[PDB]
Amino acid sequence: MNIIRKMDWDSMVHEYDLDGSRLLPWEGLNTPFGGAWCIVRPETKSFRHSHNEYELFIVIQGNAIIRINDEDFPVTKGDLIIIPLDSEHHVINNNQEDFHFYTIWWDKESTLNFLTRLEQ
Kindly list the residues in this chain that would bind a second copy in the complex (CB under 8 A).
Answer: 1-7, 9, 21, 23, 26, 28-33, 35, 37, 54, 56, 58, 60-61, 68, 71, 73, 75-84, 102, 104, 106, 108, 111-112, 114-115, 118
Q: Measured from the CB of residue 87, what is the shortest distance to Ni ion in angstroms?
A: 8
Alpha-carbon dihedral angle through residues 43, 47, 48, 52, given to the nearest 10 degrees: -140
Region of residue 80 (phi > 0: left; psi between -120 and 50: alpha; otherwise: beta): beta
What part of residues 36-55 is at the interface with Ni ion (CB under 5 A)? 55
Please identify the residue of the shown chain whose CB is closest to the bound Ni ion.
55
Cβ(2)–Cβ(28) below 8 Å: yes
